[PDB]
Structures are given as C-alpha cells and as structure tokens.
C-alpha cells in the first residue's frame, strides 16, 4: 500500500502517462498526498501553475494546495498566481482572500486588494494657527468615532468646534499621481483651504454624519433642530459652488434619498 | 456605509468633479482597496451619478464597460430590479441607455417587472413597462416588449414616442 | 522565549524515526511517547507560527507608518511643486 | 487556524490507532505523519517568509530614508 504510493509518485513525475498509469477513495487520498509531497518539493525547489493546471485537468484539496502556495510565496509570485486565479474564473477561497487582506499592509498594495475584492464580488517662520489644526482634526476624529457622538461634553466640543470651523468656511468665500488619504500637515495648511474639493469632502462627511444621526441612542430635540439648521447652512454653502452648485446639490439630495432607500430596505 | 464615511465621501467628491477615464478607474480601485468598500455599492453610486448626470453619456458608459469587464453580467440586472422595486423618469432613462448600446438584457428585466392582471384587463376591456417603452423610443428591444397587441398603442404617450421616432 | 531561542526540525525527524520504529514493531510506551511528542511539536509549531505572525504584523504596521509618513512628506513636496 | 484543527485531528487519529486492519492503520498513521511533515514544512516556510518580510521592511525603511533625502532635494527645488 505504500508501494502503490511509490508507484503513484513514479507515474506522476507527462500528465497523460500519469493518467494512464494511475488506474476507491483511499487510492485517491494517496494520490492527493503524493501531489502534496511533490508540490512541497517544488516549493522547496511557474511549475506550481503547471501542477495546478494538471490537477484542474484531472479533477476540494487543490484549494488547500493553492492556499499553501499562497502562504509560501510572499509578494511577486503570489501576484502572478492570483492573476492565474483570475484567469481560472467554497470557504477556502474566502479564507485565502482574508489571509491576503490580513498579510498586506495596504501601503502600495491597495490595487491588489481591490482586485481581490472585485474577485470576491465576482464570486458572490510663517505664523501657524495650530489651534485650527487641533480643532479641525479633533472634529475629524469625531467623524471617525460616531460612537463618541452620543455623550454630552463631547457633543458640546463638537458644537463649539463645528460652529467655529463653519464660521471660518463661511468667512472665507473663495468664489472660484494621486493623494489617497488626508494630509495631516501643520506646515502648509493653505492649499487645502484654497481647494474647494477638500471642503466638498468635509461637507459630504457632515451630511453623512447628519443623515446617520437622523437615521438608548437618543438625543435632545433641540440638538436635532441645531442639526437641521446647520444642515440647511451646509446646503447653502454647497449651493455656493461656482461650477454647478444647485445641480450637485440636487445630486446630493438624490443620493441621500437613495441612501434612505438602502437603509430602510435592509 | 455607516463605518466607512471618508470612502464614500471621496467617491462622491471624485464623481462630483467637472469634465481621463482610466485615471478615475485607478482612483476608484484605490478607494476600494483603501477603505474596504463594497463593489456593489460603488456600482450603485456610479449608476446614480449617471442617472443624475445625463450630459456625459459615453464617458460613464466606457467607465461602466471597463468596470463590468471584471464582474458578472447579472449584477446590473439584479441592481436594476432592486431599484425598480425600490420605487422618476431617470430610472427609465438609465434603463434605456443600458439596453440600447451594450449589456442588453431583456428577459431578466422582464422577470423583475402583472401578466395575468394585464390579460384579465384585456379580457374585461373587450406601469413601468410603459415608461420603458417611452424612454427606449426617445428599437428591436421595444418590438420584443410588444410581444396585448394594442395595449401600448392605447396609451397616448407611447403613440407620441412612436410618432416622434 | 526559550522555545524561540532553541528554534526544531530535528524533533520532527526523531518523531518520524520513532514512527518508522513503531511501524516496524507493528509490522507500547514508545507509541504513547511519540504521540505526546507529536502533540508537543504541533503546539510548539502553532506557537512559533503565532509569534512569527505577530512579529511580521508589527513590522508591517511599522513599515506602513513609515511609508505613510514618507508619502505625506512626498505629497507635501508635490503640492509645493504644483504651487510653483 | 485550519492547521491546528488538522494537528488535533492527527493526534486524535494517532490516539485511535494506538487504541489487514493493522496494516491499514499503519498506512493511515504514515499518511498522518506525512501530513504532519507537510505542516512542519509549511511552518518553516512561514518562518522564512516572516524573515524575508522583516528584510523587506528594512529595505522599505532604507527606501523611506532615501525618499526623505529626495524630499529634501525636492524642497530645495521647490
């Protein structure tokens, strides 16, 4: 019975001769463990893609074998084998994709993670106002933590800082290679203020927070009236966009209605 | 949506710019890779932008073709069935665009959109399909919709669509 | 700590030799000792894998923080070049 | 994750084998030993991948130092 295992390893080491000399579950288990040993030797010693094509031609366990191969090969050959998997198209696929998401640091591999998620979707000096920096990014952390937006004192700081930042935004009145995340730079501070698109990001984030608050977990009705007043002022400031203020405002109204639709159905 | 706010904010503000397609594709892939974005919800955002922007047609058509080259074709059918069950002539406009140029799918949308009630109304005589016949004529697909024989011609606006054609 | 300093595969080779000796004897206490050694080797392999994964995750987080700082500096330099 | 369950199943199969039939049990025990050797080789490859990832992180830190030097040169050019 291990003599049959050695005969199987002689026959597999081309593929048509292995299929001829291969000729009922334990024999297939010995065959699959022979493929395990040969793939482990090839990982010790491209050819892995050829053996995966051989298993896909002959034949469960190739998911485990590809998971072992993706666990071994870190960065480049993992990318080529994932392009091979994209050319190929149960729970083992989700486990491999979760391992690829957890191992990558998303510093420059965000494109590869997006391809993974598309595959899963196919499956299923100068005077610097440092106080402005501190208040603005404390509000940004308030956006990051809506769970913190339920208390009293944190809500009071949110009220004060939000009214001061919106007062600065109303008082500015501008009237006119890719950067992934927000730039927490105390040095320049003026190119973000001169760019109206950054304020569009911030006011969209305000509108999403306001729609979430409208969507325990109770608030004062006066706070809700304040939210509605500031929401109407946000619609006023987004109507002040010199390229298509009212048009993009109606676009955001339609998007808010559709977000309400997606919430109330699900 | 309730966890990743900056990602959808960046999607809407990047689709909110004034008019390069592949650079915006790279930006969408970067936002999906950074903020763990659901690709179906990103597709919903792109479709609702194309509803709210009827000006730049073929640009967003090319973006949807390059996006749906990496996905399954039935996903747009289930999304349009979901949006038709959610309810607005912009829905009929985007369905007429997506059933004329490419990705044409008549059977599944007819399943998602009444037949025995229409037969009983035709026997007693002797909503959104009519809007699709309005927006589609605004051609062989309409003839496939035609097969009561004179129920569409019994409405005035369908006759106005055919007469403008 | 101590098992990470001592590491490894020689214990697996000794377990394989004990398995070969037990299969030759089958054609007692050695089988129990080999099973206990196999369980201890599996636990040590899982612990070493968890420690290596934690160290790799710490290095990846530190490299991601350094890459984010360098990308912020390069983005500030690119914005200063685009301003002029 | 799944390797721990496989190791526990191998230990349970070894305990059941210690508890034609003997030859089939010896073949199953040799199969479990081969699976355990494959798991040990996967653990060794994971340790080598962790060392290579630490080396790549050190290379990324050196590239970050070179990018900081390039950022200073770009500050002079700015």
Author numbering:
A (entry chain A): 10 to 22, 29 to 38, 44 to 65, 71 to 84, 91 to 120, 133 to 167, 227 to 278, 296 to 334, ...
B (entry chain B): 165 to 183, 188 to 255, 263 to 288, 295 to 307, 343 to 354, 358 to 366, 369 to 386
C (entry chain E): 41 to 47, 55 to 74, 81 to 137
D (entry chain G): 21 to 39, 44 to 102
Task: Please give the exact wording used by the authors of the publication that reports this structure.
Here, we present the cryo-electron microscopy (cryo-EM) structure of the human THO–UAP56 complex at 3.3 Å resolution. Each monomer is partitioned into two regions, one formed by THOC1, −2, –3, and UAP56 and the second by THOC5, −6, and −7. THOC1, −2, –3, and UAP56 adopt the same architecture in all monomers, whereas THOC5, −6, –7 assume different conformations to assemble the dimer via THOC5 and THOC7 and the tetramer via THOC5 and THOC6. THOC5 and THOC7 form a parallel coiled coil, whose C-terminal ends from monomer A and B meet in a four-helix bundle, yielding the dimerization region. The THO–UAP56 tetramer assembles from dimer 1 and 2 via two interfaces that involve the THOC5 and THOC6 subunits. The core of the THO–UAP56 monomer is formed by the THOC2 subunit, which comprises an extended helical repeat with five distinct domains that we name ‘anchor’, ‘bow’, ‘MIF4G’, ‘stern’, and the disordered ‘charged domain’ (CD, truncated for recombinant expression). The THOC2 bow and adjacent MIF4G domain bind the THOC3 β-propeller, and the THOC2 MIF4G domain makes additional, extensive contacts to the UAP56 helicase. We observed density for the UAP56 RecA2 lobe, but not RecA1, which remains mobile in the absence of RNA and ATP.
The TREX complex is found in all eukaryotes and contains the multi-subunit THO complex, the DEXD-box RNA helicase UAP56/DDX39B (yeast Sub2), and an RNA export adapter such as ALYREF (yeast Yra1). The human THO complex comprises six subunits, THOC1, −2, –3, −5, –6, and −7, of which four have known counterparts in the yeast Saccharomyces cerevisiae (Sc): THOC1 (yeast Hpr1), −2 (yeast Tho2), −3 (yeast Tex3), and −7 (yeast Mft1). THO–UAP56 binds the export adapter ALYREF and together they promote loading of the export factor NXF1–NXT1 onto mRNA.
